[PDB]
Amino acid sequence: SPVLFDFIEDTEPFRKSADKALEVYKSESEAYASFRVDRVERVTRVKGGERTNYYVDFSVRNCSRSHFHRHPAFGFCRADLSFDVEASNLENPEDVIISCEVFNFEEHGNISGFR
Ligand X SMILES: *[C@@H]1O[C@H](CO)[C@@H](O[C@@H]2O[C@H](CO)[C@@H](O[C@@H]3O[C@H](CO)[C@@H](O)[C@H](O)[C@@H]3O)[C@H](O)[C@H]2NC(C)=O)[C@H](O)[C@H]1NC(C)=O
Judged by CB under 6 A, the residue of 16, 70, 94, 112 near ligand X is 70
C-beta of residue 52 within 8 angstroms of C-beta of residue 12: no
* Main-chain phi, psi angles of 15, to 5 degrees: -65, -40
Judged by CB under 6 A, the residue of 33, 63, 85, 111 near ligand GSH is 63
Partner from ligand X, ligand GSH, none contacting 51, C-beta within 5 to 8 A by type: none
Judged by CB under 6 A, the residue of 27, 66, 92, 112 near ligand GSH is 66
Judged by CB under 6 A, the residue of 41, 61, 74, 87 near ligand GSH is 61
Name the residue among 19, 40, 27, 41 with its Cα closest to residue 91.
19
**Piece in contact with ligand X (CB under 6 A), picked from 10-18, 47-55, 63-71, 76-84:** 63-71
Residue 14 burial class via C-beta count within 10 angstroms: exposed 0-12, middle 13-18, buried 19 and up: buried
Cα–Cα distance measured from residue 17 to residue 14, given in angstroms and rounded to the nearest whole number: 5
| Sites of contact with ligand GSH (CB under 6 A) | 36, 38, 61, 63, 66
